[PDB]
């Protein structure tokens, strides 16, 4: 198990997309700096305060980017999925989580039943990765943060397109 800051966002981070997140808060930008100094990641988990969620994703700093307001931007990207085995808070309010890292996603060709998903897909604007498919999909379909998150806690990639399968509109 390894002990992993966690950055609270009212949206999960799904594998392998990206987002932009404006750091300018005294703890989390000493967080960064410390972080991009010692070269330990962080991770990006829901909350639901109003405590993360039990699974999170970890994220790799793409691109820094201190703009004209001088606010810093980071470029996210999703990598590696994690659960939160427990959670605790210091005093300046960063949280930070006991976490065991998931299986990573495997390149297993996706099932019959599922081809016509990936053919959805591509329309949308290799691929017959079963966990990819899925990944993207979830990301551009309009799908609530809750179903976001189930997908994120369900750790098989074809049992992910099955799910994926019902929320589809």
Known sequence: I?????????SVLLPGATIGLRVFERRYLDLVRDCGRTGSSFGVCLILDGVPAAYGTEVR????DVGNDGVLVLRLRGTRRFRVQRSRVRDNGLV???????????????????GLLATVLERMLLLDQAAWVGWRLAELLPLSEGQRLSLLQEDDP?????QLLAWMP
Do not use: K, Q
């Open 2 to 10: 390894t002990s992993l800051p966690l950055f609270p966002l009212h």
């Open 61 to 64: 700093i793409e691109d820094f």
């Open 96 to 114: 930070v989580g006991e976490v065991s890292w998931c299986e990573p996603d495997s390149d297993d060709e996706l099932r019959p039943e599922h």
């Open 158 to 162: 074809h049992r992910r397109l099955e």
